[PDB]
Amino acid sequence: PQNEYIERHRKLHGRRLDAEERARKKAAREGHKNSENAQNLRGLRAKLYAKQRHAQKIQMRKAIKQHEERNVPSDPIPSYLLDRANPTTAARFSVPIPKVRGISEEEMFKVVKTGKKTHKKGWKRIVTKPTFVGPDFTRRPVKYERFIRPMGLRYKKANVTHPTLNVTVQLPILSVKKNPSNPLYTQLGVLTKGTIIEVNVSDLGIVTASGKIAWGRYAQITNNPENDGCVNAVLLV
Amino acid sequence: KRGAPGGKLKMTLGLPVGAIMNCADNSGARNLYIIAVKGAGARLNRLPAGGVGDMVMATVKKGKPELRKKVHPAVIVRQAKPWKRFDGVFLYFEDNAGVIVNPKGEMKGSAITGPVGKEAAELWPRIASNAGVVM
Amino acid sequence: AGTINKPKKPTSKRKTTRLRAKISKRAAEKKRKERKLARKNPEWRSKLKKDPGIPNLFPYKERLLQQIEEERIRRKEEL
Amino acid sequence: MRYIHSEETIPVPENVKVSIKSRLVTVEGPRGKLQKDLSHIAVNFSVVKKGVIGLEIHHGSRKDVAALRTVRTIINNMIIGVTKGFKYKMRYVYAHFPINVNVEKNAETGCYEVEIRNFIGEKIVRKVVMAPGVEVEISKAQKDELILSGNSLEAVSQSAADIQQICKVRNKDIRKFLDGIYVSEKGNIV
Amino acid sequence: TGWKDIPPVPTAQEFIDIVLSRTQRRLPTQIRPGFKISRIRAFYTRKVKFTQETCSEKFGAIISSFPVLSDQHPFHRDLMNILYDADHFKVALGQISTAKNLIETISRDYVRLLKYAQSLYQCKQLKRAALGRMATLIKRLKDPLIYLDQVRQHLARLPDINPTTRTLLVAGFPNVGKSSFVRSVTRADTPVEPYAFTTKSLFVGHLDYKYLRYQVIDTPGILDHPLEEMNTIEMQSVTALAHLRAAVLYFMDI
Amino acid sequence: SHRKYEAPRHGSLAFLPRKRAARHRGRVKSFPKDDPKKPVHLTAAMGYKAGMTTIVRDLDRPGAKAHKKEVVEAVTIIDCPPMVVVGLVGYIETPRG
Amino acid sequence: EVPKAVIEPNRKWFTNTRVISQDTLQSFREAMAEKQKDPYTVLLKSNKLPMSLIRDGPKLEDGLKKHQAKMTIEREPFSETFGPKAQRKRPKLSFNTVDELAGYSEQSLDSYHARLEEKKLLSVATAKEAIFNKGTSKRIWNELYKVIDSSDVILHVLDARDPLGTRCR
Amino acid sequence: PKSKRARVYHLTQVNKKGREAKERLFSNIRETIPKYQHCFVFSVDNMRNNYLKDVRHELNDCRIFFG
RNA sequence: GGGAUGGCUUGUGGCGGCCAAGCGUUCAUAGCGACGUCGCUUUGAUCCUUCGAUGUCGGCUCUUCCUAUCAUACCGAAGCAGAAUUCGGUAAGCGUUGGAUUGUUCACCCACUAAUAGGGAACGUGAGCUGGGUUUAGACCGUCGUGAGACAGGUUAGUUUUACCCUACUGAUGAACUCGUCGCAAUGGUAAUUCAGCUUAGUACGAGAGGAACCGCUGAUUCAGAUAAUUGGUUUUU
RNA sequence: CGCGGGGUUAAGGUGCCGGAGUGGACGCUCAUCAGACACCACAAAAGGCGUUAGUACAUCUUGACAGCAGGACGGUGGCCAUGGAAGUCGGAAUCCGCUAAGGACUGUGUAACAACUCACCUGCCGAAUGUACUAGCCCUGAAAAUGGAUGGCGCUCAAGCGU
Ligand SMILES: [Mg+2]
């Protein structure tokens, strides 16, 4: 068969003789069936069903409110900026996150054991949080590498939000300025929550009052990269 | 359609996986190394084994170089392990041998050297038409 | 489901002492935390609560409103 | 809330006899006689008027009051069955293989038996036995039609449902394969 | 042969539900905080890898099932261009392939992070992060999946036309008897009605002449205006006339 | 942890315990269900197993490969001298059997 | 022990750390333009600079190609092209006239055929042995990346009997 | 009564009339009473009554109320 | 001389903004806020970017359990014509296999197949056997150390050896009720499984290519219980 | 808190195990493993055509809710677009007449029409209803792995829940 052959069959021969009445009876039984599903389903299936019914009820109430209310930009932009997708756009020199949870050194460092005996030497420590190692990085040789910063936990870029411009751009990390828990953590370059980092803001188009281009600024990490797998930062402007 | 043929009575299987049989056609191969048997069941540790009339998957260990790098369906036409037919006769051939076929049953070669089994001839009409002795 | 013909493992309603003690400790910690959060709560609260009033199915609500008018008039006359 | 008193009324035609004892309702008419055991429902039967049967429930809940409507409709259906009867007309349609329907009456059991052959070319013979008191005839006025008549509406409709469900199409597109036996008409014999 | 063997293309939400239900049900779900950290890492790494493998199987099936327009005969390639807008076709399939690659990259990254996670809570957060990012990538494919499902249904109902066989190609204006001629000579079920453009797609029937199989192609009508003004329905006929080496039967109603 | 490769259990638990039978003579556990509309007949007999031998059978089994062909089958011989009937037992039905 | 992880208020957090002038940007762009490669000079310390503002942009064909798909989707959404609510009536053609269509069909048939003979010129086969997968193991490449991360100088060794064969690009 | 029929909500333009239609009919009849010399009462029983439009169009000088 | 997190977990990311039914507030108009939505994280490409063992697993042999169902049984839906499927529901009755690779996180390949589903009973420390994490004493090689020696490490060789006890389990006897024969059946256990071929039928369906099913018939796979006429094997029939 | 006898209680209990009530009054609940030592978590402003008690707003003999019998029209095939598109593939407007009332249309349908249907209105009938929230009890609101636990039997106008 070719093209709309089922539609052609419906035109030529119709449907089954009980199809209309059985569809009407099933649509009439939908109310009892939905109540039975609400009172009898179990587990994750029941939870998903209840959530999706909650969504349907919210959408239906919105539609009814709109049908009741049938009988009744923000920032000034030029003509060439009209009809485009524009952002909504919403002394004490305090950072947005002045205090975070402190990290102990046993949480930061785990002991790496070495040796072939049953008793092991335990002088090596491994950093368990994401770090920034900076450019031109070569690891110390293994005989003198006390602190291990694994390559899988190294980050070079972060999602930085400008609070005023209401934009989020992925920017390269320039340096780690201050880890709030320990200067040793700052020296190792650990990227945790509340950390002040230096970011490249060339893509944000910031121009100083004298006409120079500001390509390096400060951001604060607002997330937990060890839990999220990404670094989220807010510019300190 | 998989290669296991229907209407086959139970017989003693004499060729497990890893057996090398002779190659009874003129396709250019000299021997066939069994790596699988079509229609084999599932049982712990049991080697899949075939008999006369069964389709196996086989590699070529010696013969023409263009047949050495491919896996071919084959039909076992002779086996050396004795087996019984429904007429009460126990019998065996002096060697193990098969012929290379396609999955549909037609042979790659054009002639068969030596006899073929009655089971193989009855199950595969192309082998029965290319057999000089049905035996 | 085939619950009647083939029931599954029963869910025990018999408690354990460890779970009872843990639940009691968590309830005490939760009520202390609610007291602390209510103390630290910055939500606005009115000095006078919104009174619901007199129910409509009360058959003498009209006479109650008459009494309220008469009492307010008498209080205004006295003051 | 428990309702102190609730009642329903059923009129009885002139040629209809009704006898109720221990909630066992027997209704006899020109066409025959029917029985129904209603002892699973708490109801007080009475003769409120000449030719009117009264149904009462005392100190009952909403569920118990609502059950009296079902009892009323059941007794009215028995009365209609013994007065006018019930008739279901069914049609069998086909595309290529003509459906062969044979109707016989089993002498030992006293029930009708319907044999269906060549349903979409199938070699099996479908056999469906009617409820007692239900007569099946192949219609002569219309093409490919069965008529099931009786005094019991439940028996007639259930026999029609069994014939409808025995010819089920499996593992085929039902938008394309339209073959089957369907209830085409419901009504009274008279 | 045809294109009826393409598996059904779900929506974004159905895709997410299918993948997450496979992850939830075909794998164990109970893990304890008191277990070994290697056991916890293996549990969550297996969850992430299984989710990615299910996504990869579905996306690869979608990519390998649909026709490749560069590998078709010019008639089939230009017919698919007329019917489905080859640009939109290639864009949707490229989005599918890009999402598959991105999901594999996220799986590799989060498996690498799960190698170094130190607790069940951190492992759970990393697993949820990976599956949430995959769900976001699938949610960004709402329109191409619907478009590809419609294209799949039309391709399944498309007739099979061999471009290198004996072919009688019937063309002309509407309402001149093309479908009547094709119904007379072949067994094809093409409608015959008195209004213009009754036939809106290519139909094909078959006849036997001197023990040989001939295919006959019924076409929509063609009007007298240039190719920039011709629509898709007439351009099916124009594509058939341009790319099929056949015998043209141009019908005239005098 | 779970078993890595599935395999069915050895032997059937339906034939437990694998002990010696309590009697040398076999026991009919169940006789056929009685139909009073049938004529009277005896449901069982005794014999003594003598040995085995070989036959050739001309097979009439339509649909089989050995149809209209000779087949060799193993058979068992049971020596059956005629029994002697010496008694009659009556059984009633009780709520204990 | 858990420390007090606190950040003091400071005016330095809200200032620019690195600035650059337009003249310096022009000088660095000219240096980038005239930069050449010398095998006998090595890089010892990179200069921290805005490469995004210094290096040149991509080619115009690449810039158009990276946005053609999004541009076509913005011009015509998927729902207006095919489906129950599609409004597409005029197809997009690579030809304008009937003569151009005839020439295009001839060239398309020639190209289809030529691709067919090229593919022709270019039972299941036995699987490739696992011995030929040596040197591709995750453990081996973990070792390689560990050595690369540890080393300053990398001696890449080439067999003289097959140097380009043994080169690792 | 938790077990009840779910009322369908109509997403249609025309709403129920209510008391203002009754008041409008009152005002229309009471304002057309003094303008006319005669008031006939007519009956159309068990009829489709779609030809009252034609009757109204033919008797353009008269006023017809069918409320 | 001591010592050897837990009614946890599961399917849907984080940060930032906006909207928001609702909660509060209506001497302040702030503050919480689901459902959502927007930003950051290849025209079906590329294959010249594999990113760190402190955490150790295996294998047989055998039994049982869970369901979060791969297959088999039934059912609902989809342009589902047919065929092959896909999504989902009830369902653990019954199955779920060889094999290759130890330059190595042994995990991935190839095949047969109805299908080659996932877990628990250890790994919330732990005497069946046997390879790796693995490590007494002998020995080289690399790194460190003036050295004794220690390790970033790599390699080789290397001592634990019950059961006759109680219980459990599998079988076997048995006192008291004279001995024996024929029986009943409470209770416990319980069993079959899947595929193929002939016919239906080149039929329904289909433009063509292709292409079923119910009834009927015959074999085979896995399992189970027996048996020795025949064919093999076994020989102290010495 | 010495060793004993008699009496009375506390906490907890009185269907049987188990001493003491199948005690009394008024209600609520039926669970496909209810509940009986709950407060914590799952868990939400959560899902229920389960069952009662309330609150607020609204309709109603000038006839409310439900039904049945009928009407559902005219400018008009409104504008643009489309091969075709007439309320019903789309984009935007969405007014007037006749009105008792009828949308520049709620769905089915046609290639387009036609046809059917809904909103709304009239006739018949006959007295109470409708919506949204709140409080009780009930169901769901996630579970693994030997066979088991309100302590056990069992209990349904309780031997459950509130006083
Ligand atoms: Mg025409």
Give the per-residue SS3 of chain A: CCCCHHHHHHHHHCCCCCHHHHHHHHHHHHHHHHHHHHHHCCHHHHHHHHHHHHHHHHHHHHHHHHHHCCCCCCCCCCCCCCCCCCCCCCCCCCCCCCEECCCCHHHHEEEEEECCCCCCEEEEEEECCCECCCCCCCCCCHHHCCEECCHHHECCEEEEEECCCCEEEEEEEEEEEECCCCHHHHHHCECCCCCEEEEECHHHCCECCCCCEEEEEEEEECCCHHHHCCCEEEECC
What is the DSSP track for E97-129?
A: HHHHHHHHHHHHHHHHHHTT--SHHHHHHHHHH
Strand D24-28 relative to strand D33-37: parallel, antiparallel, unpaired? antiparallel
User: If DSSP codes are grouped into helix, strand and coil, which group holds residue E76?
Assistant: helix
Give which of D99, D83, D79, D80 is closest to D144, Cα–Cα.
D99
Neighbouring-strand partners of residue B97? B22, B78
Looking at residue D124, the DSSP 8-state letter turns out to be S
Resolution in A: 2.5
Distance from CA of B59 to the nearest CA of G (A): 8
User: If DSSP codes are grouped into helix, strand and coil, which group holds residue D26?
Assistant: strand
Q: Which of A151, A196, A214 is opposite residue G13, by nearest beta carbon?
A: A196
Give which of E129, E131, E121, E106 is closest to E40, Cα–Cα.
E121
C43 touches strand I (CB under 7 A): yes
Residue of G124, G126, G129 to mutate, testing the B interface (most B Cβ within 10 Å of its Cβ):
G126
G89 contacts E227? CB cut-off 8 A: no
At C18, which helix (H) or strand (E)? helix C17-40
The residues, ordered by sequence, that sit 6+ positions from A108 with a Cβ below 8 Å of its Cβ are: A127, A128, A129, A181, A182, A185, A190
B88 contacts F56? CB cut-off 8 A: yes
Alpha-carbon gap, residue G136 to G130, rounded angstroms = 11
Alpha-carbon gap, residue A10 to E148, rounded angstroms = 26
Sign of the CA dihedral with E122 first, then E127, E131, and E134 last? positive
What is the DSSP track for E141-168?
A: THHHHHHHHHHHHHHHTS----TTS-EE
Spell out the SS3 assignment of chain G.
CCCCEECCCCHHHHCCCEEECHHHHHHHHHHHHCCCCCCCCCCCCCCCCCHHHHCCCCCHHHHHHCCHHHHHHHHCCCCCCCCCCCCCCCCCCCCCCHHHHHHHHHHHHHHHHHHHHHHHHCCCECCCCHHHHCCCCHHHHHHHHHHHHHCCCCCCCCCCCCHHHHCCC
User: If DSSP codes are grouped into helix, strand and coil, which group holds residue B33?
Assistant: strand
Please give the distance, rounded to the nearest whole angstrom, from the Cα atom of residue E82 to the centre of ligand 1: 22
Residue E203 near residue E218 (C-beta atoms within 8 A): yes
Alpha-carbon gap, residue E149 to F80, rounded angstroms = 77
Q: CA–CA distance from C33 to each of C21, C45, H3 (Å)?
A: 18, 20, 41
Alpha-carbon gap, residue B58 to B34, rounded angstroms = 4
Strands (E), B1-135: 15-16, 20-23, 31-37, 49-50, 55-59, 72-78, 83-84, 90-91, 97-100
10 Å CB burial of residue E70 (0-12, 13-18, 19+) is exposed
I85 C1': nearest CA residue: E7
In strand J, the nucleotides that come within 7 Å of a protein beta carbon are: 28, 32-33, 35-41, 43-44, 46-57, 59-60, 62, 65-66, 69-73, 82-84, 89-90, 98-106, 110-111, 118-122, 130-131, 139-145, 147-152
Alpha-carbon gap, residue G10 to G14, rounded angstroms = 8
Q: Which single residue is written with the structure tokens 């021969």?
A: A13
Tokens of E25: 């049900």
Alpha-carbon gap, residue C36 to H17, rounded angstroms = 57
What residues of B form the annotated binding site for Mg(2+)? 41, 45
Q: After which residues is chain B broken (C to N over 2.5 A)?
A: none
B86 contacts F66? CB cut-off 8 A: yes
The alpha-carbon radius of gyration of chain A (Å, integer) is 30
The residues, ordered by sequence, that sit 6+ positions from H66 with a Cβ below 8 Å of its Cβ are: H49, H52
Residue type, A104: S
Q: Which single residue is written with the structure tokens 């259990």?
A: F9
Sign of the CA dihedral with D28 first, then D31, D33, and D37 last? negative
Give the N- to C-terminal CA distance of chain E in Å, as an integer: 39
CA dihedral G71, G72, G74, G78 (to 10 degrees): -150
Expt. technique: cryo-EM
Alpha-carbon gap, residue A8 to D75, rounded angstroms = 49
Q: Please identify every residue whose CB atom is under 5 Å from ligand 1, which is an ion.
A: E 175, 198
Looking at residue E24, the DSSP 8-state letter turns out to be H
Residue B78 near residue B114 (C-beta atoms within 8 A): yes
Q: Which of A31, A64, A67 is opposite residue H6, by nearest beta carbon?
A: A31
In which region does residue B73 sit, left (phi positive, over 0), alpha (psi from -120 to 50) or beta (all else)? beta
Is chain G in touch with chain F: ≥3 Cβ pairs within 8 A?
Answer: no
Alpha-carbon gap, residue D21 to D40, rounded angstroms = 14
Q: Which single residue is written with the structure tokens 């060697």?
A: B95
Alpha-carbon gap, residue B108 to B102, rounded angstroms = 7
Give which of D93, D78, D80, D96 is closest to D25, Cα–Cα.
D78
The residues, ordered by sequence, that sit 6+ positions from B64 with a Cβ below 8 Å of its Cβ are: B27, B28, B29
CA of E208 to C1' of I169 (A): 80
The residues, ordered by sequence, that sit 6+ positions from F72 with a Cβ below 8 Å of its Cβ are: B86, B87, B88, F54, F55, F56, F57
Tokens of A167: 């934009």
Is chain H in touch with chain E: ≥3 Cβ pairs within 8 A?
Answer: no
Give the N- to C-terminal CA distance of chain A in Å, as an integer: 68
Residue of H4, H10, H11 to mutate, testing the A interface (most A Cβ within 10 Å of its Cβ):
H11
Looking at residue D108, the DSSP 8-state letter turns out to be T
CB contacts of D175 in chain A (<8 Å) are 6, 9-10, 15
Residue type, A83: D
Residues 56-85 of G with CB under 7 A from strand I: 65-66, 68-69, 72
The residues, ordered by sequence, that sit 6+ positions from C59 with a Cβ below 8 Å of its Cβ are: none
Alpha-carbon gap, residue A213 to G28, rounded angstroms = 14
User: Looking at chain E from residue 146 to 175, which residues have their Cβ under 8 Å from any Cβ of chain A?
Assistant: 157-159
Alpha-carbon gap, residue B73 to B54, rounded angstroms = 10
Strand D134-138 relative to strand G18-20: parallel, antiparallel, unpaired? unpaired
Judge whether F12 is annotated as a binding position: no
Tokens of C17: 């002492």
Phi and psi, residue F70, nearest 5°: -90, 135
Alpha-carbon gap, residue C50 to C45, rounded angstroms = 11
Sign of the CA dihedral with F69 first, then F70, F76, and F78 last? positive
G125 contacts B69? CB cut-off 8 A: yes
A5 contacts E189? CB cut-off 8 A: yes
Strand B20-23 relative to strand A232-235: parallel, antiparallel, unpaired? unpaired
Tokens of G57: 């942009």
User: If DSSP codes are grouped into helix, strand and coil, which group holds residue C69?
Assistant: helix
Alpha-carbon gap, residue A46 to A54, rounded angstroms = 12
Strand B31-37 relative to strand B55-59: parallel, antiparallel, unpaired? antiparallel
Find, in chain G, the residue whose alpha carbon is nearest to that of E147.
Answer: G78
Strand D24-28 relative to strand G18-20: parallel, antiparallel, unpaired? unpaired
Give which of D175, D145, D150 is closest to D163, Cα–Cα.
D145
Contacts 24+ apart (CB under 8 A), E230-237: E231/G89, E231/G90, E231/G91, E232/E82, E232/E83, E232/G88, E232/G89, E232/G90, E232/G91, E233/E197, E233/E200, E233/E201, E235/E82, E235/G91, E235/G93, E236/E79, E236/E82, E236/E83, E236/E201, E236/E202, E237/E171, E237/E202
Residue type, F35: D
Tokens of A122: 């335990």
Alpha-carbon gap, residue A159 to A234, rounded angstroms = 8
Residue E48 near residue E108 (C-beta atoms within 8 A): no
Burial G126-136 (b: 16+ CB within 10 A, else e): eeeeeeeeeee
CA dihedral B37, B38, B44, B49 (to 10 degrees): -40
Q: Which of A103, A151, A211 is opposite residue G145, by nearest beta carbon?
A: A151
Residue B21 near residue B98 (C-beta atoms within 8 A): yes
Alpha-carbon gap, residue H38 to D132, rounded angstroms = 71
Alpha-carbon gap, residue D103 to G111, rounded angstroms = 70
Alpha-carbon gap, residue A108 to A189, rounded angstroms = 12
Q: CB contact, 8 Å: H47 with chain A?
A: no
Contacts 24+ apart (CB under 8 A), E30-34: E31/E120, E32/E120, E33/E119, E33/E120
Tell me the residue length of chain C: 79
Strands (E), F1-97: 48-58, 70-79
CA angle B98, B104, B107 (to 5 degrees): 40
I55 C1': nearest CA residue: E38
Residue A112 near residue A127 (C-beta atoms within 8 A): no
10 Å CB burial of residue A219 (0-12, 13-18, 19+) is buried
Chain D residues bordering chain A (beta-carbon distance below 8 Å): 91, 93, 95, 164, 173-176, 178, 180, 182-184
Alpha-carbon gap, residue G52 to C58, rounded angstroms = 79
